[PDB]
Symmetry: D2
Subunit: 394 residues, 4 copies
C-alpha cells in the first residue's frame, strides 16, 4: 500500500531523494493536502536522513492516496517537467514583445513598470509552475467580474441572476432592458447588487473575500485602498451607468445604488498575485473544487455559467476573435491580468501591464495564442486527431 | 487475440450468439469496417477455428468493442435515455411548418465517434439540409484553402449584411454562406463543383444516403429575392473573389441548400465533425483538424440563428438548424446527432429539436463547460 | 397726421369710440407702446380736434398703422373668430394622459400675439404653468445671442437624431443638448446670478408680462432626476462641458430652468419675439440677435416635437416646441407667436389638444412653411383683406 | 391702361428699340411665351411700317397686364439689374474654388460652371455654361415625386414611402423618403401604372416639359446604358424592396429599375431647369407660361422633403446654414428653390466628399449670407443682409 510506493522509490531512501521526486511531479511541499506527511518528515529528521520501510510508511501514510497518484503519474499532466519547459519557452517568446500602453488613467495603474511579466500555472491536480514576476500584487479590476458572477449564481441560481442580467455578447441595455452580460460594467454593477442583499458593504465585502480566499486555496488575496480611492474619484462613466440602471429599474427592490457603486469599486480593487490567481482559475478549471485544498467552493452550475460567459464576453471587443482563435474561457483586466481557464486541465494568471488598443495585455494575448498554437487545448480541438499539436495529458 | 475473444463468447459459438452480442455494443453488422468479417460469415456454429478465420481481419475493432472500450461503454443504457428524451420531445405539439411536409414527423439519430449507432422516429425519411449545409461547405472551404484565406472573405463572429470590415459577419448567415460558396473549387464550372461537394459529403457520411431535391431547388431559386438582393449587394461591395459570376454562385448556393439527407446519414456527418475530421464508420480522414475546429467554433456561437447565444449558454454544443426542421448536433469526442421535426418556433428552429437538445444536456454532462470530475447529478455516459 | 386720423374717426369724438375702434384693430389699451397716449387720455368726456391731437400725438405713427389697416393681419376680428372655432374644435378632443382622482375640469387655452402686437386669447390663458422643455429654444437663443453660433456649436449639434459622431449631443432640443447649453450661459457668476440673468431675458422676450418660478416643480424635478444625472455624468465623462464646469450644479440650474412659469398670454409674446426677428412686438425693444432667432427657429423645425418632429414638420410646417406641462410654443415667422396649453399628452409626449389645433390652423391657413403666397388652393390667407 | 403705359415710357413717339431695351431691363425675355402676341404685332408693324400712341396701343394691348406690372416694378424683384449684378459676383466667387472630383485623370478642357435664375414672375438671368445639357440624375427625385403626389395624392404615395430624414427601410418597412434611392425606386413604381415603360416615360417627359415652360428637356442614352451596367446596388435595393413587399400590387421590379435609370438620364440645361425650380417656387404654376402644372399639395410636400432630405448627408447642415429646399445630383447639378421668389439651377461637375457639387454648395452659402432668403430669416428685421424684394 504505502509499502508499494516505498519500493517504486534499496533498503533505505534518503529523504532528499523522496522530496526531489515529489517536487518533480509538480506538487509543492507546502501543499495543504501534504501537511501531515511533511510534518512527520520534519519531526523524523529531529528524532533520527535515511528512511527505512517502516519509517516511510509512518511519514507517508496519512497522505498516501494523493502521493500514490503523483508517483503513479495519474495527474492530469503526468510529465510536468516537460510541460513547464514549454511554458517557459512560450513565456520567453512573449517577453520579446515590448508593445502596448500601460493604463495611466489613475496613479496606481500608471506606476507599474511596462516590463513586469509573469505567468503562473495551477493544474486541477494542484501542480504548480511560475516564471517571471508572479509574486507581485496587482488589482483584479475586471478579472473580478466572473468571480462575483460565480458567487451570485452559486447563491441565487441561474434563473434569478439572469432576470437581472443577460446571457450573451453585445456585438447600455439589450432588447429586454437588461445589461448584455456579467462581463460588461453595466452587467457587473447589477451582479454586484445581487450579492448578499440586506447587509452593509463591510459584511458584503468580507463575505465575498471568504469566497476568493477559498478559491485561492488561502493564498494571497488583498486590497488596494489607493486604487479604490482613485477608481471612486474618476468613476464618472460608472456613475452614469448607475443612475441609468436606477432609472430603468434594473436593481433589486430596495437597492441603494450609490452604495452598490462603492462596493463595486472595492471589488475591483482586490489584490492578487499570478500565483494566487492561478489557483482561483484552477478552481474554475476543476468544477468548483479548489485543486490544492480539495475544498468545494462553488456549485458546478455556477462554474459552467461563468466559463460560458468568459468564453463569450471575457476579452472585451476581442472576445469573438479570442474565442475563435484561442477558444479558452478568459477574463482580461485593465491592470494587465488575464485569468485563463483550460477546463479539466488547469488555470493560469498571465500578467503584464502594457495594454493593446482593445484593453488586453499584449504579452498575455500573445502567450495565449502560442499556448493553443502549441497544445490541443482549444475548446473545439479533438483529443484523438490533433494533427501536429502536442497533447501534454499524454 | 482472436483466441481470447473467442473464449469470451462451450465448444462452439452459434453465429447468432456472436451477432446479437456484437449488435449490443452499438455497432451494426453492416459497418463498412466490419465488411471482411461479414463476408467470411456469408461464406459459411463456429468452432474456434472458423471463428478465428472470420474475425481475424477485423480483430482490432471487434476487440475494442467486446472489451467495452468504445466512447460509450454501456450503449444500451445510453440508448434507453435517448428514447425517453425522444418520447418527451414528441409530446411537444407546437411550432409552425415552413412554406409541404407533415408535422408529427420526428426522428433522432446518433453516431458515436466509434461508430455506435441508434435511431428512433422517422429516421430514414429524406429531407433538405437547407442551412444545415452551411457549416459543411464552410468546412470544405477551410479544408481546401485554409483559415487565413477563407476569413479574408468572411467574419469569424456573431452579429446582432456586412460587418465593420465590409465582410459578411460569419459563414452561418446567408450572406456569409453565399460568399463561402464562391470560394470552393474556383474557376471550374458549377456542374463539377456540385459533384465535388457531393463527393465530399459522401465521405463525411461514410457513403450513406445523400441526395438532391430538384423541386426544392426550383422553388428556392424562384423565391430567392432576399438572397438575390444579398448577391447584388455583395458583388457591389466587392466581396467575392476576382472573376466570380455571382448569378451563377446563387444557383450553386440554392443547389447546396437542396441537398438531401436522412437523420441517419446526417448523424454520421456530424460524427465526422465530432471525430476530428475522421469518419467514424469508415476510419477515413475527411476534413483537416483545422477545418473541423473552425467549423465547431462557428456553430457554437453562430449556428442557431437569433437563438445562438441562448443556445450556447444553456446547451453548450455546436449545432446547426435549417428550415426543414433539421438540427445538426455535435458533442465533441463523443457523438454526432441529427434531429428532425418540421414544425419550427418563432426563431426558425425545430420545436422538438430544441426541446430534445435542452433535455440531453440537462441529463448528461455533455455541456461544453461541464467538468468531467464534478458534475453533480448529471449522468456521464462515458462511464 | 393727427388730423388725418381724427377726421377718420362730427365735431367731437366720445373717446369710448376711439377706444372701441382701437381695440378693434387687435391692440390692447395696455400696450407699452401706447402708454403716453393712455396717460394723456387719463389726464383728460369727448375729444375735439385739439384734445385728440394732444392725447394721440406721442404715439401717432403706431395708431396710424393700426387704423389704416397696415398690420400683419388687417382684419383681426375675423381672424380671431377663426382661432375661436379651431379652439372649440380642439377642445372636443379629450384623449391623452397628464385610478386617477379628479377634483376639477380640464384646462385648455390658446393665446395669439402678432408681430404687430395684436393680441387674442380664449380658454385658460392666465393660469401659470411651467415651460419645461419649452424653455429649450429660449435658453438656446440666449446662448447664441451672447456667445454666437460658432462657440455654442462647438458644444452641441445642429441636427436631429446620447452623442453624435463628434461626441456632442445631437441638438439643443434634446435633454443632453439642453444640459450642455445650460452650461454655456453666464459662466462667470454663481447660480443665483445666472438664474436672475435668464429671468431678466425672459422678461424682455415677454414684454415684461408674466414670468415666474415654481419651487414645487423644481423640487419634484430634483427628486426624479436619475435620468438627467445619468446624462450629466456621461457628458462629464465624455468632456462635453466647457472648462471649469460644476456638472452637479449645472443640473440644478437646469431643473430651475425647466421650472420657470409662464401663462399662455405671456408665452405667446415670447414666441412673437422669435416670429418678429428678435424684436419684442409689444415693446419694440431689440431682445435677440437675428442669428440667435434664425438658429432657434431652424432647430425647432426639425427637432422641436420629440419623435413627432418629422411628422409635424411635414404636415404643419411651423417651428414649435412642446413640454410635459402640456405647452406648445408655436411660431409663424413674420406673422405671429402662439402658446397652446392643455396638460393631457399623447403617447409621444405632446399635448393632445395642442397638436390637434396646430394641424387645423394650417389646414385652414396658408401659414405652412412651404405653402405658396400666390396660389394656396382652398386655404385662407389672413394677411389679406 | 395702354395709354398710361405709353406715357411712362414716353415725347411724342417711342422708338421700338427703346421699348425693347426697357422691357429687357425688367428681366423678362423677349421670347417670353406670354409676350408672343405683343412681339408678333411688333414685328408685323416694322414690316408694314417709331410707335405713336395708337400704334403702341395696337402692339401691347393683348399683353398689357403683364407689361404693366413689369414697367410698374410690381415684379417680385423690382430692381432686377441690381440683383443679377449680385448673382454674377457670387458666381465669380464660387469659381475660384476648384476643389472636388468629377464622378491620374486626364483633362481635355476647362471645368464647367453655370448659374441660371428664373423668378416667379419669369425674370431671367444666366452666367457661365448655362446652355450645356447634363443629366438630372438625383435632381429628378423631387420632380417625379411631385408627379406621383399630383396624380395620386399625399395619402397613397406615403402609404408606400416615408416622410422623414433617415438600412434600406424604416420602422414601417417603407423606404425613408423620396430622396433616397430606395424611396425614389418605389416612387418610380407609382407613376402611370399599367402601361409600358415607353408610355410612362413619355408621360413624365411631357410633365417635365410643362414644368420647364417647354424649354430643353432631353435624354442621354449613353448615361442610361452606363447606369444600367453599374446598377448592382440598385438591383440589390430592387430585390430587397420586392422581398419586403414595398411595391404596389402587380409591379415588375426589373422593369421598374429600367424606368428609374431612364429617369436619371433625362437631360436639362441650367436654363430649362431653372424654370422647373421656379415652377416649384411658384406654387405649381410655370412662371413663363402661366400654366398650372402641379397641385399645391404636391409642391408643398416636395419642398418640405427637399429641405430636410435633399442634400444627401449634408441635408442637416444645409438646412441649418442655408435654409432652402434644394436637390443635388452626381452630374454636379443643384436644383434650388427660394419659395415665393425664384428657382435656380447651379451646375459644376466636381463633387465634394459628400457627393455635392463644390461650386454649387459654395454658391448656395454665399447667396444666403448675402440675402435674407433663408427660410428662417425675418422679412422685417435682418441685419447686414440685403433684401432684393425692396
Ligand atoms: Cl478593467
Ligand atoms: Cl434554412
Ligand atoms: Cl418636457
Ligand atoms: Cl445622383
Amino acid at each position: 500500500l504505502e509499502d508499494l510506493l516505498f519500493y517504486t522509490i534499496q533498503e533505505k531512501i534518503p529523504v532528499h531523494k523522496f522530496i526531489t521526486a515529489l517536487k518533480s511531479t509538480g506538487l509543492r511541499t507546502s501543499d495543504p493536502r501534504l501537511k501531515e506527511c511533511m510534518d512527520m518528515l520534519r519531526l523524523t529528521l529531529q528524532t533520527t536522513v535515511m528512511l527505512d520501510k517502516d519509517l516511510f510508511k509512518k511519514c507517508v501514510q496519512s497522505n498516501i492516496v494523493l502521493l500514490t497518484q503523483a508517483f503513479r503519474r495519474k495527474f492530469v499532466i503526468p510529465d510536468f517537467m516537460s510541460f513547464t519547459s514549454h511554458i517557459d519557452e512560450l513565456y520567453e517568446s512573449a517577453k520579446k514583445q515590448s508593445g502596448g500602453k500601460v493604463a495611466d488613467y489613475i496613479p496606481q495603474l500608471a506606476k507599474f513598470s511596462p516590463d513586469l511579466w509573469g505567468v503562473s500555472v495551477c493544474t486541477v491536480d494542484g501542480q504548480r509552475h511560475s516564471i517571471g514576476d508572479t509574486k507581485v500584487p496587482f488589482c483584479l479590476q475586471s478579472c473580478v467580474k466572473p468571480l462575483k458572477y460565480a458567487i451570485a449564481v452559486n447563491d441565487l441560481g441561474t434563473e434569478y441572476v439572469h432576470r437581472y442580467v443577460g446571457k450573451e455578447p453585445s456585438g447600455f441595455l439589450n432588447e429586454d432592458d437588461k445589461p448584455h452580460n456579467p462581463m460588461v460594467n453595466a452587467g457587473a454593477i447589477v451582479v454586484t447588487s445581487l450579492i448578499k442583499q440586506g447587509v452593509n458593504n463591510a459584511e458584503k465585502f468580507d463575505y465575498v473575500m471568504q469566497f476568493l480566499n477559498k478559491m485561492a486555496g488561502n493564498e494571497y488575496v488583498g486590497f488596494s485602498n489607493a486604487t479604490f480611492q482613485s477608481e471612486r474619484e474618476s468613476g464618472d462613466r460608472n456613475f452614469a451607468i448607475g443612475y441609468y440602471l436606477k432609472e430603468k429599474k434594473c436593481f433589486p427592490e430596495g437597492t441603494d445604488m450609490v452604495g452598490i457603486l462603492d462596493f463595486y469599486f472595492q471589488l475591483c480593487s482586490i489584490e492578487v498575485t499570478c500565483e494566487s490567481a492561478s489557483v482561483m482559475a484552477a478552481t474554475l478549471a476543476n468544477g468548483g473544487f479548489c485543486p490544492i485544498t480539495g475544498e468545494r467552493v462553488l456549485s458546478p452550475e455556477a462554474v459552467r455559467n461563468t466559463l460560458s460567459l468568459m468564453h463569450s464576453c471575457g476579452m472585451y471587443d476581442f472576445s469573438g476573435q479570442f474565442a475563435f482563435h484561442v477558444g479558452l474561457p478568459a477574463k482580461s483586466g485593465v491592470a494587465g491580468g488575464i485569468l485563463l481557464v483550460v477546463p479539466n486541465v488547469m488555470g493560469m494568471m498571465c500578467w503584464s501591464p502594457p495594454l493593446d488598443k482593445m484593453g488586453n495585455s499584449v504579452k498575455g494575448i500573445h502567450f495565449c495564442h502560442d499556448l493553443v498554437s502549441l497544445c490541443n487545448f482549444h475548446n473545439y480541438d479533438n483529443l484523438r486527431h490533433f494533427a501536429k499539436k502536442l497533447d501534454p495529458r499524454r
